[PDB]
Design a protein around this nucleic acid. Sequence first.
DNA 1: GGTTACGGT
Length: 138
Amino acid sequence: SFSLLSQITPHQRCSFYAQVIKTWYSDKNFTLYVTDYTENELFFPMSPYTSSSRWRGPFGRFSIRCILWDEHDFYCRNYIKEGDYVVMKNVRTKIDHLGYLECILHGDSAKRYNMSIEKVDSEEPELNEIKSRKRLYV
DNA sequence: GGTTACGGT
């Protein structure tokens, strides 16, 4: 089933709709920061006071970092863009060394876990709640 | 498999 981001907990498999806020590519992986405009106590409290950040919101504990490895990296790195909506299915969660939630997509060549990430056209009704909540923070 | 809310590649 699908969860809101406020509902996810560490060390589980989950699926959710979200909007991509930030992407970062490296030679090791591809990173997404995603939000569905619901709060989670385990998310990093994003500060509006940072000098010179390119982040424009949401602020506080409203976004989660996703680390994409292997085929997930190679597929998304020149495809998923900031602002895109995505549906992420059967991804894994963890807690990092500092105690924050993170989402991980490990390579799965064996096709054991049926993981996926795909773009969702902005017009899809599955995104209505994300859009209605975003209005609260603009 | 990586480190820390940036950097803006």
